[PDB]
Assembly symmetry: C3
Homo-oligomer: 72 residues x 3
């Protein structure tokens, strides 16, 4: 697994672990469930690029302790 | 204190700090309270072994930044 | 940004990132919102000193991976 941070605009940082070839939608759904948020209302980006349903950490060239940004 | 991670099957990783000779039930109860979960429905394991009410990090040979796995 | 930990008496550790010259009330409000807590009922301290509305990490001489303590 690699460890990823999900950072909100409020400064909150929530941690996940995910395998490099697993879709990031695993993480996005878990974030929403754990944080009581809706995909209808939030968006996830990595180094400015939107993350799609099937993108994986390896495809997006993510490394351990990288950060995903969440926006409204 | 040592720092411990509690990892769910969804990839969520939640952090605790606990003294080495304090029972892990402190951590288990705090996890349940903070995550809105019930002991009735979840179980905690460390390197495949169930964690009991009075087990301590020192007894289970846990070290800083180790991970506890949570299951349904 | 620097990374800060917010530690509860239950051993929970929640992470934030904040710029050094931004008021810590950003973090305090985010903690309360994310944790479903009220400022009416909790207090934040750093190395024994209460944190006020306009105190910044730089003013309080905080560094990456320092811990803020939360109390009832």
């Amino acid at each position: 697994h690699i460890n990823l941070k999900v950072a909100g605009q409020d400064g909150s940082v929530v941690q996940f672990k995910i395998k490099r070839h697993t879709p990031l939608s695993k993480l996005m759904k878990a974030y929403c469930e754990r944080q009581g948020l809706s995909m209808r209302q939030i968006r996830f980006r990595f180094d400015g690029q939107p993350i799609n349903e099937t993108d994986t950490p390896a495809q997006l060239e993510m490394e351990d302790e990288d950060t995903i940004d969440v926006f409204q």
